[PDB]
C-alpha cells in the first residue's frame, strides 16, 4: 500500500500502477495506495466558479454583517462576505471585521459596472494603466473577468497595507461621481426659499412607517390658517420642525418656559431670566405658535391687563408678510409686528443711491401709521421698525465685499477672508459712492428715532463695525446715532406732523410731551421739548432766492430759541450733543422756524442745500429747543389702567418710549481672550445702553452652533443654526461666552433696568448625526412636489436623529409644572390644528416623524439601493427581506455537478449543460465534460483539444484529470505533465525527479 523505488529509497506519489487486472493509485500527499478502479467522484464537489459565487455571498443577513439604515442598503454599504479571497489567491473564512464594499461584487447595471472598472483603473490603479476603457457596448463576460481582477487586486492591496481605510475613501469617491448618487439627481434649485438648493418633504409610507405622521400641516401662516390659500413657505433651512404636531407644540412651549426661566433653571438665579422673545421665521411655521406663546405669556404675566403689565415683557416678531400685522392685531398683539411697509419707505427714499431714491412722500403714507397728522394714541397697530438687521441689508452685502476682496465664490470664506472683506466693506461704508452699504444712514436713523407710534430698533452694525471682536471698532455713525438716541430720550414726544414741499423737502416735527396738534398750547414741560427735522434726498438741491423751508413747531413754541442737533457739511455732518456751541435759530410769533439758501445770522451750515458725502446725500438738519435742563426726560411711563380691548401692547407715548437694541452682527469674531467675549462686554456696558434709552436688549440666539458650514449661520456661528435647542453656551461656550457669561449679562442688564430678549427659533434644527431612512419627495419651499424630479415617494437617507444632551435633559421637563400652574394652557384649542397641545409625550430626541422635511443632502435619488423593478433591498427590518442576488444564497438544485443515469454532467450559471470543456473544482482538481456533456472517468488515454493542438489526457475513475505523475502499465510507463498532457520525446523534471520519455511516451530512464 506504499510504492518505493528500493534502489533510491524514494516513494512514488501521485502514481497509477497496473498489477495484473488490478490498478493501484498512490496519492499525492503520502503515496498511500488505493484501488484505482473504486475511486469515486466526490458528490459534494463544487466548481471554482461556484466557490467564487459563494465566497462573495453575505456572511449573514444580520445588522452586523451588512451596513444599513433601518434595514435599507446604500451605495456606501459594506458587508461581511462568507469568504475573503485573501491576498487575491486564497479563499479564507471571513472574520467579523473583514468588511468589503458591496460595489466590489454588485452594480446596479452594466454601464455602472463598466464605469466602476474605468474608475478603479484610473484612480484606484487596480487594473493595468494600459488597458482600454470599457464602453457602453462592453460584454458581460468581459466585465465580470475584470471585476474579479479588481477584487483580486483589492485583496492584494488590503493584504499589503493591512487596512481598508484607503478603500473606504476610494469607493466613496467613485460613488459620488454617479448622478444617481450625487446632487445631480436632486434637481438643485435656489428659487424661492430653497436657500440650500432644494427640499425633500417627508411623506407617509409603509416602507418607513416609524417616520409617519398624522400632522405635517404646512404653510399654515397668518394668511393660510384653514389651508385653503398659499401661505408663507414652510421650508426654509436644514431640518424643518413640524410645528403643526401638538406634541411638538407642547415641546415648543416647554422650550419657551426654559428660556423665560433660564436663570432660575440653570443657575438658581432669578436675575438671569429673559424678559421677552423674538419669534424667528414667523412666516415659515404654523401660526398656532403665536397664540401658544400669547397664552403662556398671558397666564404667567397677565400681559393683557394693562400697559404697565404688557410693557414689562417686550416681544417682537420676525414677520415679513404684509398681511401679518392685521392678524397679529386680531390675536391681541401678543408680540409686536414689524412695520415692513415703513422700513421699505426708508429703503426707497433714503437708503438708495442718489439716482435711485424716490420722492420722500412715501415715508408719510407707506406704513401701519399715517404720519401727516398723527395726533392720537391707542389708535394704530403697535409695531417696531428698524433700518438694518443682522440679516437685512447686512449679511448679503458683507458677503459681496468678501467675494470682491478675496475673489472666492460667494459665501465661501475663512477668518482671514472675512477680515479682508470687512476692510473693503468699511472703506465702502466710509465712501460717498457706496456699493455695499446703505446711503443716508443719519437721515434713516433720524426718521427711525423721531417717528411717533413706533418702537425703533437700533442695529449693532450701525454703531460698531459688523466684523471685529464685539464692540472693537465704531462705525462713522456711532456719534451721530448715539446723539440721536440721547436726544430722543430728552426731547422726542407728543404729536407728529410730516409733509413734503414743492421742492421735495421733508419736514418732520414732534411737538413735545403734552401737545398732540400744532395748535395745542401744551403743558409745563412741552416748552423745551419736541424736535424739528429737515430732510432732502436731492444731492443737487438748490433753493431759489426767496424760497424757504418752514418747520411748524406749533403754538407751544412761539418766539423760541432752537439749537442744532445735526447739521450737514460738505464732507460729513456736525453733531451737537447739548446746547454748547450749537448754531441757533428762532421761531416766529407763530412757532414757525424758517430756513433758506442763506445762512442764519452768519452761522455756517444753516442754509438748506444739497450735499454728497459719506453721511448725507441730500440734506439733513435736526433742531431742538435750547435751554432744556440736562436731566430732561420726555418719556412716558405705562399706565396701570385696565385695557378695554383684548391686547397686550398699545401704540401710545409709553410704548413709543421704548427702544430695542439688536446687540449683535453675524460677523462678530470668535473671542481670542475671555475679556473679548460678547456677553462679558454686554455685562460691562449695561449703563451705556441705558444712557441711549435702550429699554430692551435683543441678544443673539444663544444656542451653540452646529458648526457644520451648511449655511452662513453655521459658518459664522451666530446661534441660528444649532443641533441642541437647550445648549446655551453650556456644553462649551457659544460665540458670545459660556452660559455663566450669558447669565451675568442678563443680570447686569436687569441691574441697569433693561429687559433682555430671547431669540426663539422654532423653525428648524441642524446637523443631527443619526441617519434614518425616510420616504421623501423633492419639493419646493411650500412642499409642492417637484414635478420633474424622480424623487417622489422614494426612500432616502436623512440626518434626523439626535438633538444633544440638553434636549435630552430638559425636553418636556417643564410640562408638569406648566400644567400644575397654568392648566388653562392645556385646554386652549389652536386655529390651525383645531385642537389642544399634547404634553403626553416628551421630546427628548428628534427623529423624522417630528419634521416636515430637510434641505437636499446630495446623497442622490438612488442612494438607497433598489432592484431593477424598483423593489428596495432590506435586511427585513422595515420591509421584506431582499438582498442583491450576489449577496444571497442560491438554490443549487440542478446546478453544478449533477449525476444523471450513469453519467455526471455540469450545469453552468444558466442551468445549461456544459459540453467539451474542462472545469476545475474548488480544491484544484480538473474535470472534463465531453462533447455529449458527460464527465470522462474511464482511466484511458484520450485525445482532447483544449484549443490547439490535440493533447493526450487520462481521467481517473473519480473523473479527476491525472497530472504531474507516472502511469506504469504492463506495456510501459508514461508521464503526464502539469496540464495533464502526456509528454513525448523529451526530458522533463518534476521536483527531484528527471524523466526521459521516448517518441511513444514510454519512460526510457528516470533519476
Ligand atoms: O404671493 C404669494 C407669496 O407669498 C409668500 O411670500 C411672502 C412671505 O411669506 C413673507 O414672509 C414675505 O417675504 O413676503 C412674501 C410676499 O407676501 C410665499 O412664501 C411666496 O412663495 C409667494 O410668492
Ligand atoms: O429669515 C427668514 C425670512 O427670510 C426671508 O425674508 C427676507 C425679506 O424677504 C427681505 O426683505 C430681507 O430684507 O430680509 C428678510 C430676511 O432675510 C423670507 O422671505 C421670509 O418669509 C422669512 O421668514
Ligand atoms: O396705515 C395708514 C395708511 O393706510 C392706507 O394705506 C395702506 C392701505 O390701506 C393698505 O391696503 C396697505 O396695503 O398699505 C397701505 C400703507 O402702506 C392709506 O392709503 C395711507 O395713506 C395711510 O398712510
Ligand atoms: O422644469 C424646471 C422647472 O423647475 C421649477 O418648477 C417646479 C415648481 O416650482 C414646482 O412648484 C412644481 O410645479 O414642480 C416644478 C418642477 O417640475 C422652477 O420653479 C421652474 O421655473 C422650472 O420651469
Ligand atoms: Ca417650517
Automatic annotation (TrEMBL):
UniProt GO BP: glucan biosynthetic process
Sequence ranges assigned to domain Glycoside hydrolase family 70 catalytic in this UniProt record: 102-902
Keyword set, alphabetical order: Calcium, Glycosyltransferase, Metal-binding, Repeat, Signal, Transferase
Transferase keyword on record: yes
Catalytic activity as recorded in UniProt: [(1->6)-alpha-D-glucosyl](n) + sucrose = [(1->6)-alpha-D-glucosyl](n+1) + D-fructose
GO molecular function: dextransucrase activity; glucosyltransferase activity; metal ion binding
EC number, as in UniProt: 2.4.1.5
Record: residues binding Ca(2+): 234, 240, 284, 763
Keyword Calcium: yes
Primary enzyme class: transferase
Annotated coiled-coil segments of the chain: none
Ranges occupied by Cell wall-binding repeats: 915-935
Similarity-based family: Belongs to the glycosyl hydrolase 70 family.
Function: Production of extracellular glucans, that are thought to play a key role in the development of the dental plaque because of their ability to adhere to smooth surfaces and mediate the aggregation of bacterial cells and food debris.
Protein name (database record): dextransucrase
Organism per entry: Limosilactobacillus reuteri (Lactobacillus reuteri)
First and last residues shown, out of full length: 746 to 1752 of 1772
